[PDB]
């Protein structure tokens, strides 16, 4: 069966026909290790990012790209590339950058190198259209094909899961990324200082500091946050038992 021909014939994307699309004690240890959720309303364009301390083990960066608002303040790659992410990343640390499906696949790599990371994985969010096979797609001028996925690039600096996430394409105007990306990140056991830039009230999560312009409330206090990682807890992976 040629699912590409089938999509031409019917409008059902080939990913509609992927099927099926204990690592639960790790999930339990992650849950015990997680810091309380912390969050800060901040206009990241006007905000001195260096006020966010201490340096982070993991950064999830989710700038609101114009392409997310097809039929709907957007950040250009010009804006994103000028963020001083290297000033808040720990010397050994990881970044997860949502890059969309167009020029971000190139400019997001420029950003990673600019900030001192090398790309080690390319995580693809593949979007099914099982519920709306007919609804076609208005294309980017430069596009050659209908775009049915988004990429989240993983970068590393310093010394169980698959690189695919498959969910149904969300309703128009819904910009949320699949929460499964948090599972992948947390299963890496990378450390407990986790920052989500451009998160929202809806993405706040235990074990994460969420910073973003649309947050309605804040509880962030740099000294309180640092106290979660003071000795004897400075080096935990987030996948081990608490230190008595």
């Amino acid at each position: 069966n040629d699912y590409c021909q089938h999509f031409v014939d019917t409008g059902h994307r080939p990913q509609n026909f992927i099927r099926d699309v204990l690592i639960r004690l790790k999930d339990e240890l992650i849950a015990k290790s997680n810091t309380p959720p912390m969050y800060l309303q901040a206009d990241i364009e006007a905000f001195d990012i260096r006020e966010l301390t201490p340096k982070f083990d993991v950064i999830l960066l989710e700038p609101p790209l114009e392409e997310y608002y097809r039929e709907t303040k957007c950040w250009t790659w010009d804006d994103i590339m000028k963020l001083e992410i290297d000033e808040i990343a720990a010397p050994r640390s990881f970044i997860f950058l949502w890059c969309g499906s167009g020029e971000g696949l190139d400019l997001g790599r420029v950003c990673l190198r600019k900030w001192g990371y090398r790309r080690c994985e390319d995580i693809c969010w593949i979007k099914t259209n099982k519920n709306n096979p007919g609804k076609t797609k208005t294309l980017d001028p430069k596009a050659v094909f209908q775009r049915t996925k988004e990429h989240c690039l993983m970068g590393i600096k310093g010394t169980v899961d698959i690189d695919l996430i498959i969910t149904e394409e969300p309703e128009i105007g819904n910009i949320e990324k699949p929460v499964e990306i948090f599972h992948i990140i947390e299963h890496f056991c990378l450390g407990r200082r986790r920052l989500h830039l451009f998160g929202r009230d809806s993405t706040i999560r235990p074990g994460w500091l969420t910073v973003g312009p649309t947050l309605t409330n804040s509880n962030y206090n740099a000294e309180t946050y640092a106290s979660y990682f003071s000795a004897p807890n400075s080096y935990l992976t987030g996948c081990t038992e608490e230190i008595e």
């Binding site: 040629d2 026909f17 992927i18 190139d106 050659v144 209908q146």
Partner: protein, 201 residues
């Protein structure tokens, strides 16, 4: 001339200026990331710029060629405008399960050169779901996608193998069986450039 054509050759040394211009180029290079690989410099030096005036390049990449392939694509004069991923399944459409994650897919960059006119952009989407056949064997769906995009035009595949030969395609690779050319313009220019039938340096 519509039926499959091929040239057994070392792609490093063939004078590709004898082949004319192509609507679509595809390459699955043996990146220096059994067979002969090319160094990064040999890859950059490939005379891809002579193969097209206006059209699309399909460039398979893996590992650190994700970045090197983008470099080559831009050096050769292309802008990357799409990225196809092939989701690898078994015969029951389950994903076949980079040192951090297991890899469920392969990537094909799509570059554009000039201003192609008359292509059917938007007919296919950018995800292939297809069974893993042999080792390093790319999915046959890519040829149909390319044919619907640019039906009836001339195409050229670099680093192909005998199973890759297709109508409308000329296939280049060092494991092909000799030289099989049917297009009269290509035959004429090949005879003139290689009168004794041998490609050296």
């Amino acid at each position: 001339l519509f039926p499959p054509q091929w040239i057994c050759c070392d792609i490093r040394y063939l004078d590709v200026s004898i082949l004319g211009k192509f609507a679509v180029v595809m390459a699955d290079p043996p990146w220096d990331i059994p067979y002969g690989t090319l160094t990064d410099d040999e890859m950059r030096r490939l005379n891809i710029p002579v193969l097209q005036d206006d059209g699309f390049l399909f460039l398979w990449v893996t590992g650190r060629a994700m970045e090197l392939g983008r470099e080559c694509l831009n050096l050769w004069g292309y802008e990357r405008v799409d990225e196809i991923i092939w989701v690898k399944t078994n015969q029951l459409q389950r994903i076949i399960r980079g040192h951090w994650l297991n890899h469920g897919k392969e990537h094909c960059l799509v570059g554009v050169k000039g201003n192609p006119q008359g292509f059917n952009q938007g007919l296919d989407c950018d995800v292939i779901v297809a069974e893993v056949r042999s080792t390093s064997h790319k999915p046959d769906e890519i040829y149909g996608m390319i044919e619907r995009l640019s039906p009836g035009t001339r195409k050229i595949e670099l680093f192909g193998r005998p199973h890759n030969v297709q109508p409308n395609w000329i296939t280049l690779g060092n494991q092909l069986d000799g030289i099989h050319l049917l297009d009269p313009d290509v035959v004429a220019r090949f005879k003139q450039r290689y009168p004794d039938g041998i490609i050296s340096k």
